[PDB]
Write a protein that binds this DNA or RNA. Sequence first.
RNA 1: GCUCAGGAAUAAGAGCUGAAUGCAUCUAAGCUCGAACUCUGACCUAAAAAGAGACCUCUUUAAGGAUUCCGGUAAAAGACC
RNA 2: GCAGCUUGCUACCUCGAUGUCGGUUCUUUCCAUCCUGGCCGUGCAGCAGCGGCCAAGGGUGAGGUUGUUCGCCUAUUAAA
RNA 3: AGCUUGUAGUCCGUAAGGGAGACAACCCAGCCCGUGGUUAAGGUCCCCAAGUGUCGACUAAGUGUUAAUACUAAAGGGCGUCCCAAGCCCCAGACAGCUGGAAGGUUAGCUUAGAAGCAGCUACCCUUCAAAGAGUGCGUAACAGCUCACCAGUCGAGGUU
Lengths: 337, 138, 159, 44, 132, 176
Amino acid sequence: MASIHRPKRGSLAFSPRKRAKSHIPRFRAWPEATGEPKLQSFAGYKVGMTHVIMVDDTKNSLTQGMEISVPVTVIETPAIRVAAIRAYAEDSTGEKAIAEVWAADLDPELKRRIPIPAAGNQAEALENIGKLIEEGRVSDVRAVIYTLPKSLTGVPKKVPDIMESGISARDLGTKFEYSKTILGTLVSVTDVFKNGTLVDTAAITIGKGTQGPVKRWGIQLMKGKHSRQGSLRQVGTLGAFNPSRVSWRVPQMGQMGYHQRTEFNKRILKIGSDGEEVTPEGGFINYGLVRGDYILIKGSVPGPSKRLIRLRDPIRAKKADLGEPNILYISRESKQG
Amino acid sequence: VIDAKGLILGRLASSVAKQLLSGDEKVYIINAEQAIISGSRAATLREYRETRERGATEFGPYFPKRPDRILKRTIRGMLPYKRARGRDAMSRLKVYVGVPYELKGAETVTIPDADMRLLSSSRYVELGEVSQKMGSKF
Amino acid sequence: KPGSMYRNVRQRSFTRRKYMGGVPGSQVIHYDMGDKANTSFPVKISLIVEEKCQIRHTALEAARITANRHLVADTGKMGFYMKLRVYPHEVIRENKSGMRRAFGKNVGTAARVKPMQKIFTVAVEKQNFKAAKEALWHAGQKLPTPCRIVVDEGAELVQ
Amino acid sequence: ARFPEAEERLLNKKICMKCNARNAIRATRCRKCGYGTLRVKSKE
Amino acid sequence: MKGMRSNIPRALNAGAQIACVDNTGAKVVEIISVKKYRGVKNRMPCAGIGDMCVVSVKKGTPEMRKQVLLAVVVRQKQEFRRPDGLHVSFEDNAMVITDEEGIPKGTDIKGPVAREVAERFPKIGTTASIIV
Amino acid sequence: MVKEIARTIEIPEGVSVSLAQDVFTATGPKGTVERKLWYPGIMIDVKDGEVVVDAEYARKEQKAMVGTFASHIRNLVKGVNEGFECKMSIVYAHFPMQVKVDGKTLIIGNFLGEKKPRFAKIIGETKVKVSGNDVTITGINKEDVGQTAANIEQKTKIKRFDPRIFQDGIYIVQKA
RNA sequence: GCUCAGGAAUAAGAGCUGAAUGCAUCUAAGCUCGAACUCUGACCUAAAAAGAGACCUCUUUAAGGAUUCCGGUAAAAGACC
RNA sequence: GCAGCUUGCUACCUCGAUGUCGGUUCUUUCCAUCCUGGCCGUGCAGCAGCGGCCAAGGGUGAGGUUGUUCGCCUAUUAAA
RNA sequence: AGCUUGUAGUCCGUAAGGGAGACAACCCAGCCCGUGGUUAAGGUCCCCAAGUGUCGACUAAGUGUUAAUACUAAAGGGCGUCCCAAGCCCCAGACAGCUGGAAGGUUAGCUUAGAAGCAGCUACCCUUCAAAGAGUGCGUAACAGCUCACCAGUCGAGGUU
C-alpha cells in the first residue's frame, strides 16, 4: 500500500492533558540574572481585551513607522506583598528548602489561605540564613510573594494567591541583601517589569470540560457518505490489529482546557495607574471596571477574564532592547456594542 | 558501606547481591558514579543508550538515569526481586552518588576482586560518564 | 539461474546419456591452452578445490577464459601450458503443475569434483610463476567452491 | 593563479577507489576500508 | 515573495471560476493550482489577494480558451484587514493574466485593484486605472 | 639480533622530568608541560637525566605503545627545551584575507568575500603571529601547536567549490 | 497573539600528534572538529519516587476539613475555585 | 548472498467460520533516503548534475480516467 | 522446505523423574512406597546448590557468553593480532631515512608549417667507468629547471617474499 502521510493530530508535548493540579501556574525555570537585583516575576488578574492604535516601532518591519491597530490584553496588577524569603540548598539529589523567614507583619486576609505566621523569629532567622550562606549551605534564594485581590472588584475573591519568585542578582550575597531589603514590603509592577519589554505569561487556560477528540485534538470528521453512517465526530480507528492495545498517542476524549500554558515574548505596551484610561463605557463584560494599576500586554494571553496570570522576565527572548511603545489611542468604546 | 570507586560494576553487584542474600546486613554503596564498566566507550555508550531508549517507555521498561539508581538496577537484575527475599534484599540496599552527609567519615570497605586495576587494558568508562551522556544531573 | 542451485552434492551421479534425452552441449570449447606440444616447463602449479561440489560448464568456461586471458597477456601466446582436467559428465536437470511428476528436464552439464581434486594445471618457466599464480587466483574467483593453488613441480625453482 | 603551498594540502592526497576516502600520498592502502589500490586525487 | 502589509485570507480554492478583467480575451478562468503553495492532505489549493495561480481559460476568445496561464487575483470578496485595523472587501472576485515575473498580459484593467497586489507587483498597479 | 623493547630519552640540562602518579611533567627554560601517559603493561622510570620506557610484554601492541610513549616524552622534552615553530602561508586569488589575533582566537575576515569572519581556536599558550602574508605559530607543546595550525587550516576550508579552481585559505608550510 | 537559540557528546567525514614499521601514516593508544540524530537547554506532567521526599507555619479536644447556604474563572457524576 | 515487501512450492494451524479486494480514518515502526541536515569523489570552473557514505527528527500534498492495488496523465511542489 | 516418499536402529505415540529458559520424541534415566547416602546428564559470578578453581595461551570484536536440533549468514578480503615452516639479503654493514652526480649519448625516424624521450612501432647506443635508460612524475605549440631505477659516506640491526 502506498500511503498518504499527514502530520499527527495535535501535540504530544502536553501529555497527559489533565486538569492542572492548582489554579495558579508554577514556574519550573528562572532566567539568568543580568543586572541590578529585582524580582523576576509578578502576578496579576486578566481583565479582558481591547485594542490600541500605535506607531510601529518594531525595527526592520515593513509597517514600521506607520499607524497599526494592535490588540492588547488588560491585566489588573495590584501591588504584591513579599511575604517570605526561602533559601535553597543544592546537592546531588537536587534543590531542597533549607530555611524560610516570614515577614513580621502580614495582611490579615492571608488567613483565608493559611494560618498566619506569628511575629516570632525574623532577626535571628535572617542571621541564621546569613550564617548558612557564609558556610556555603545555601545554593540560592527565592522570594515567596502573594497577591492582594481584595482591592479588585471584578475578581470576587479576597483570599490571596501565594507563589515563589526568583531574584535576579549577580551573586548570592547580593540576592540575600536585596531579599532582606524587599522582605515584608509591597512591590508594584513597575518594580518588576518596565514598559516596552518582553515577558512570558503563564496561566490556566479556558476550561471546556470533557471534549471529544474532534475538538480536543482537531481530528478530521467523517466525510461524504461516512458523515451520516453513525460515527461523525468520532475517530476512525483506535489502533492496528497488532500491537493489541490502544496507544496513548491516539486522540481521544478527555479534559480540555484548564491546563497550564506558557506564552513567550508578549510585549508590555503600557504600565498604567488609573483604570479609567482603559475601562470602556459600560465596563468590561462580567468583570466591571479597572480601579487599580494595570498593564497592557501586546497580543493574547492564556486564561479567561479574572484568571490569575503570572508574568515573568523572558526566558527565550530573541530581540534586544525594544523601546517604549508609542500608544496613540486606547479604545474605550463599549465592548458590549 | 562499600566504596564503589574503581570497582567493576558487575562484580561489585554480584558480591553485594550475594551478601544481601546471605541476609545479615544493610549495605550502603557510595560513589556509584565512580564505578567502572570495562569495554570500549563507544560500545558501552551504544548499549546503554539502547537500553535507555528501548522500551515502551510510556508503558514499558523504565531504565533509570542517575548512576546510583543505575547501579541499584544492576544489583536488582541479580536478585529475586519479585520474591519476598529479593524484596527485603533491595530494601536493605542504599546507593549514593558520592558520599551522603550522614555516612560522611564512616569506615568504608572495598572488594579486592572487584578492583579495576586487575583489568588488562584501558578500554573502560565510568558509570558517571554513562549517566551524564544519557542526560542525568548528579 | 544462480550456480547455488546445482552446487551442493546431495544425489547419485546422473551421467548415462543413453537413458536420458536432449542434453544441451557444453560451453567449454578447449581443454588445453598455451603451448600444447612442449612438456619441458619447469614450474607446474595447479588449482585444487577444497570442498565437494558440482561445477557447471559455464563456470568452467568462465574460469578458463579468465585464466587464459591473464596467461596470454603476461607470459605471451606460447609462454604457458594450461590443462583443464575435468569434463562435465554429470547432467544437470531442472523441474520446469508444481511437484507432480517433478523429475526434471536436462538443462546442462557439470563436473562433480572431490576435495583436493585438480581442476586446472598451469605449466610455465621460472620467471612466470607469479603471473600464473595470479591468473589462477583470478580463475578460482569464478568457481563455486573455495580453492587453493599448490605447486606440483618447481618448488625448489621458486623457493 | 594556483598556489603550490595550497595545492600541496588540497590536491596532493590519494583517494580510495572503493570508498573515495582521502589517504596520505605515501599510503599503499586505504585507512577506512583497507583497499590495496589508491589513486592520486585528480588535479586535472 | 515580498511581504504584504495586510493579512489576506486565502479565499479562492482550486476549481473557482473567476471573471478575468483585462483585455487579453479571457472572460472566465478556472483556478487549477496556486504557485508557491504547498498544501496538506485533503486541503484544496487556496488563494487570496496577491497570490499567483495557474488558471485555465474557460470563457473568452478561442485563442485564449483551454490555455494554461498564470493569473494574479486582484479582487476578492472575502474581507481582509489592513495593518491599521480597517477591514476591506470588494463586491466581486477578479483576476488579471500575468507571467511568472508578475507582468500583466493585458494593457488596461477595468475595475479597482487591491493596494496589496498593486504594491507586490508594481506593473499591475500601473496597468490598473484606480488602486483601492 | 636481540630485540629490545625498552627505549631511552635523554634529559637535556635545565630540564627536570618527573612522573609522579601516572602523569609526566617536564620543566624547562622555555616553560613547563604536563601530559598523561598511562598504559597497563608499560612502565616508565625517570633517573639521572634519562627516562626509560619499557614494556613488561613484547607483543606488537606493547612495542607500539613503548614507541609512542618514547616519542611523546621526546616531544615533551623538546618542547620544554627548544620549543616548536610552525609556518603557514596566506594565499588568495581575488579577496584579500584580513587575518588577525583577538586573544585566544584568530579572526579571518573577508574569507572568500564572506560578511561573517571565521574563528580559529588557539590551543594552550601558543603564540600566533601574523607577519604580513605568513603566520608563525610558536609553542612549548607540539600537540597544541599542531592543533592550532590544524584549526586554522580547517577554518580556512572551501567546503563547496572545486579545489582545483578555489584555493583560498591558510595552509601549513612547515609542521612543528 | 506566541511559537530562533546556545552548549555538550557523537555518525559519516576532515585533521593534529604518533609508533608498530628509523621514514611515512587521521589510528593502534591519545587529541581537535564535525549533522535536521542523541543529551542538555526556555515547555507540559510528576511525592504512589516502597529510598513512598524537603522546608516553614499553625495547633494538639485544637489547627483545620467536610456538610448546609449564595455562587462561577470550574464542572458528565465527583472534583475545583 | 541478504530481505520476505512479487509470483511460485508445500499442506504444519484454522472448515461446530480468524468476515474476503480496494479506498477512507487514526496510530506506529523499518531504511535499502525522494526532499530537508552533514560529508567524500568527479570526466566537480560557477549554475546544475552524476556516483557513493552517514542520518529515519520533520515532510512526502492537490487533481482526470479506472473498483482497483499497480500504472498512465495534469498542474503545483524542497520532494510530491 | 518444520516438503514428499523409502530404509536400519531408537524413541514419542503410550514414558515418569533429573537437566538443557521453556522443548512429544535432544542428554541421564525407564518409575512400587518411606528414609539415609553416593552418583549420571548438566553445572559451580548472582538470579540458582556448588569455584570470582588451577595451569598454558588466544580474543578487543560485548565477538562470544547457542551439544543435536532447521532455533546458528556466505563468497571474497584484512601490512588486526597470535603461531609453525621455507626461500632471499644481512657488522666483507642488510631494510627505511640524512647527504652528494643523474656532465658523452639523441634534439632517436613521425604525413599536416606543429606534441623531436611520456600518440607511436624497435636495441651486444659508447672503448670503459665504484656512477648516467631507447623512458618511472605536478608540468612542455617544438626545448628546462623541479622526482627516479643506481654504486658512494651516515648512525648500526635485523629486513624482505
